[PDB]
RNA sequence: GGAGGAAGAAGCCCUUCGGGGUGUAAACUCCUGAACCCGGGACGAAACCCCCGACGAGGGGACUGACGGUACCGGGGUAAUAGCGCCGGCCAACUCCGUGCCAGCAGCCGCGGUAAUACGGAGGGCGCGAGCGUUACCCGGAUUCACUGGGCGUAAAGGGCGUGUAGGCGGCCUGGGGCGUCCCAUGUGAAAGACCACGGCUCAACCGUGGGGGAGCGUGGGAUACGCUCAGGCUAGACG
RNA sequence: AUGCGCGCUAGGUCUCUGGGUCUCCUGGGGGCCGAAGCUAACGCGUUAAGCGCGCCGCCUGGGGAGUACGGCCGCAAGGC
């Protein structure tokens, strides 16, 4: 049901006694393109157990993305350590213009029409974090109206 | 590489028994030949690599059911080592993959030689799958039905989707099964000429059948009176299209004026 | 800064530095040889380099690389210049181009042949 | 200068089947049926996982052999397109059918589009009972097209529209086979055609 | 040039020496006719000028084409130019042979000392196409002068401190003025260019007709919420 | 290695110096742990490096270099 990519895979190194030991790194997005996206970094030894255990976390730390069609309800700017993300929502048929971690993380949320934008560090792995964490602070007209009138 | 149930799935479509001999083309790594040495009784490989052929020696060392012949598989006398491996078995079938470009000709050499087999079982494409078991009345309807029809009885068991390949294929696959009957569906005075006909009937499908008969054939055009008569006095209409006949409609035709 | 500092003394600008002042702001340049010889790359490298020395039509004297598999420059050798630099040499910032003047397009070229020269090779 | 020379090689570097030989690409000899693999010397060895830049070039690319336009002439029409009012992707793939080869193709007048564009500019074709020798004409919606009276007797023209006779044309377009004639009705939708490209690629490859 | 056209012609390259790549490309069959040859042949040109008018408004009469025998029409007509860059990552597209830190490549990272998909050649493949690359200059990417939209403990960045001039900014409660501010009407914002619609060159570039939009400024008339000013009161800032 | 002024935002503990209805309450300083929050991190955290407003000074990659020329100051070294 849910689909998979890879954000990116880095190889990191430790010294110990006369030696370097390396350790593999993955960020995985995974999602349905339905309104609903998770992403996940798992660290292995090797570099398929990297993948199982990143697409392991990815499917628990999952958001829902209030969708309408097919863009963002509303622009948000989210700051993440040194990166920052803009996000504009777009009329049909515009599609998506992202750099690659952006586009990869929408894609999979079913989003087809945004502009987005990089700004400050463009670390992917900030980069990734500052896009989940725009993505679960978006409201809509009903959420807005429920907690104002009530 | 498949899926490792797929190959499952087909090697129960070829209903083979503990007591069946196999024959099959082009192993490779040798996923499919594992999965039937198991089932299988004797497993005959013909295979000309030299380089996935040590994988395939490793592959294959834990049985005594299989093994390999470095022999091309066109360049064979296939009715010897039919003879010569399989004194023991009860029933013969042959479950193979083949390669692309080099998937019709195998086929057709296979039929044509008339082996003492039951069927065949081969993925081949899904369009040329589709091909080869259509009814008469269909739109891909064509040369190669006529081919095959006539050896055997053909039908798709079922389709694999162009997603469970790890290299993700251009194309789509399918799986079709061959039961060989014993002997012809319909007598033939000349085999050859009934085989230049079936070329000739289908050559350009929009025309009609009676301008194809008289156009291609070699020489149609010295004697054209004689096709309309003897069209006519078979009850085929001239001004219909090839594509409708069927086997028996263009067997009389063969018949024909030999 | 405040609003009021910058009303007061403004944003400076950034203003470019040509990386060929030789050319002045020409494509390319006519000038003639001096010293025809070779030179030796940073540490990292090691080879021979081909450096002409050329007087332009401009009141300046350059270095420029050559480029090829061989030259045919004496120290008379009209020459035309072009912008280019080459990293390894420490003080090259141009190159010459083959077969315009004096220097000719290397021969037997096959791939490349926009550059250095080399008229179509006719084969029956 | 359009693209001239081997055919069915795109058929196959594009993976999908781009009807651009006529009715040989019907018969088991497409090359699509055979040798199905990307043309060349390494046209069997694994293929590395396909770049998003790679991707959207690739789906261009299949787009634009389909119509058989040039790059310049493809920008230039989705620069057009991308100005107007609408969904860019409709109003793109609504132009590109406009064209008078396009038409002349999908009438049935030719059966592929490179023989399309040599009857259109030899003059065979005709709009408005007005002689037109433009492949890159735009016909609008209420055009008459029809076949000139001097090329009504040619055997290329009646075998081509003989295999036309009792098949349906496209929603969009209306067809008198006595006549020899048809009529420009509308633009076509987006579901109304079902070439195997996906517009929203091309869009993001141009809006780099 | 188009359609048809082999489980696949030779040559060349690769190879595990079994074939596979160029590749329906070709060779061939049928078909349409860029060029070329005959016969016509333009729009742009109706006025000035005369004829009755009145010497007017009306109505008739001819003369005038560099472009040019050009564009364009009507017949007859032969398959009839393809190049350039790149193929290590950025960035689309891989294999042999030659040389061994040499000859060279290089926009950055860097590649070259026996494997080198990075140099040279060949095969093959991508991109564009009568064009393709290189150099020079401008904007962008550069949120890398940060008004929109950056910063100053340790990365570059708080003056060595105080007093204070100009300047900048400034508590709350009523009023008057209407300078800033906002709104309405009107004049201007030439033509061309930009946008939209339609139309004429066989289409498009190109051109024409029409419709708006437009920062800003002048004139006339309105509003007083905020900034400003002029009056009066208060004590929460400050001073005694 | 932290410009000045004002307002708001949990507390605990030690200490210097005032006042009250005196074991506590209420001002003004000097330190230490820490809510929320901020930071690239170390850390800061009612004595902010938080949330804000007002004004001034300074930055635009390293070296060359606080160097060269010019000007002002000083007897000179030298300083801006
Ligand atoms: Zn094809």
Excluded at chain 1, 104 to 118: H, N, Q, R
Excluded at chain 2, 156 to 169: A, G, N, S, Y
Excluded at chain 3, 56 to 72: D, K, Q, R, W
Aim: aromatic residues 6%; hydrophobic residues 35%; proline residues 5%.
């Amino acid at each position: 049901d849910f689909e998979e990519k890879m954000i990116l895979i880095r190889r990191t190194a430790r010294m110990q006694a006369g030696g370097r030991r390396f350790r593999f790194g993955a960020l995985v997005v995974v999602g349905d393109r339905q309104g609903r996206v998770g992403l996940g970094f798992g660290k292995a030894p090797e570099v398929p157990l990297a993948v199982q255990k990143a697409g392991y976390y990815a499917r628990r730390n999952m958001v829902e993305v209030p969708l309408q069609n097919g863009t963002i309800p509303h622009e948000i700017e989210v700051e993440f350590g040194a990166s920052k993300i803009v996000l504009k929502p777009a009329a049909p048929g515009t599609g998506v213009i992202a750099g690659a971690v952006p586009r990869a993380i929408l894609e999979l949320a079913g989003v087809t029409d945004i502009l987005t934008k990089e700004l400050g560090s463009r670390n992917p792995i900030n980069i990734a974090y500052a896009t989940m964490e725009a993505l679960r602070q978006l409201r809509t007209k009903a959420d807005v109206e429920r907690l104002r009138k009530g | 590489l498949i899926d490792t149930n797929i190959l499952n799935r087909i090697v129960d479509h070829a209903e083979v028994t503990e007591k069946t001999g196999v024959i099959e083309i082009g192993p490779g790594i040798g996923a499919l030949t594992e999965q039937l040495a198991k089932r299988a009784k004797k497993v005959v490989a013909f295979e000309i690599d030299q380089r996935l052929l040590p994988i395939l020696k490793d592959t294959l060392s834990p049985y005594e059911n299989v093994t390999v012949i470095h022999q091309d598989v066109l360049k064979a006398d296939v009715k010897s080592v039919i003879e010569e491996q399989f004194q023991d078995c009860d029933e013969i079938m042959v479950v193979a993959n083949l390669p692309y470009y080099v998937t019709t000709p195998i086929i057709m050499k296979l039929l044509e030689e008339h082996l003492p087999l039951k069927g065949i079982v081969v993925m081949l494409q899904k369009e040329v799958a589709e091909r080869m078991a259509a009814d008469p009345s269909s739109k891909e309807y064509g040369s190669l039905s006529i081919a095959v029809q006539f050896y055997t009885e053909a039908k798709t068991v079922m389709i694999v989707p162009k997603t469970v390949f790890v290299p993700q294929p251009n194309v789509d696959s399918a799986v079709i099964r061959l039961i060989l009957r014993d002997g012809p569906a319909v007598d033939v005075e000349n085999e050859s000429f009934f085989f230049q006909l079936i070329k000739a009937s289908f050559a350009q499908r929009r025309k009609t059948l009676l301008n194809n008969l008289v156009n291609n054939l070699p020489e149609g055009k010295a004697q054209k009176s004689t096709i309309e008569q003897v069209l006519e006095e078979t009850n085929i209409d001239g001004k219909r299209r090839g594509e409708s006949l069927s086997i028996e409609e263009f067997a009389a035709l063969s018949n024909g004026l030999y | 800064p405040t609003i009021n500092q910058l009303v007061r003394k403004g944003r400076e600008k950034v203003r470019k530095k040509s990386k060929v002042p030789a050319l002045k702001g020409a494509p390319f340049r006519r000038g003639v040889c001096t010293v025809v010889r070779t030179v030796t790359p940073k540490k990292p490298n090691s080879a021979l380099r081909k450096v002409a020395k050329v007087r332009l039509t401009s009141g300046y004297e350059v270095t420029a690389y050559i480029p090829g598999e061989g030259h045919n420059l004496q120290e008379h050798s009209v020459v035309l210049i072009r912008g280019g630099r080459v990293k390894d040499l420490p003080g090259v910032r141009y190159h010459i181009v083959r077969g315009v003047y004096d220097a000719a397009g290397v021969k037997d070229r096959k791939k490349s042949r926009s550059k250095y020269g080399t008229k179509k090779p006719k084969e029956a | 200068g359009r693209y001239i020379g081997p055919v069915c090689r795109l058929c196959r570097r594009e993976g999908v089947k781009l009807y651009l030989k006529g009715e040989r690409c019907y018969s088991p000899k497409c090359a699509m049926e055979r040798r199905p693999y990307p043309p060349g010397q390494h046209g069997q060895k694994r293929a590395r996982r396909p770049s998003d830049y790679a991707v959207r070039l690739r789906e261009k690319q299949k787009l634009r052999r389909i119509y058989g336009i040039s790059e310049r002439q493809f920008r230039n029409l989705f620069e057009e397109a991308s100005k107007k009012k609408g969904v860019t992707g409709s109003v793109f793939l609504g132009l590109l059918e406009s064209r008078l080869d396009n038409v002349v193709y999908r009438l049935g007048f030719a059966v592929s589009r490179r023989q399309a564009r040599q009857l259109v500019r030899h003059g065979h074709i005709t709009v408005n009972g007005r002689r037109v020798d433009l492949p890159s004409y735009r016909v609008r919606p209420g055009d008459e097209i029809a076949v000139a009276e001097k090329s009504r007797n040619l055997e290329l023209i009646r075998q081509n529209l003989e295999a036309m006779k009792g098949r349906k044309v496209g929603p969009w377009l209306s067809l008198d086979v006595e006549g020899m004639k048809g009529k420009f009705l509308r633009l076509p939708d987006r579901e109304d055609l079902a070439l195997p490209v996906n517009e929203q690629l091309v869009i993001e490859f141009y809006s780099r």
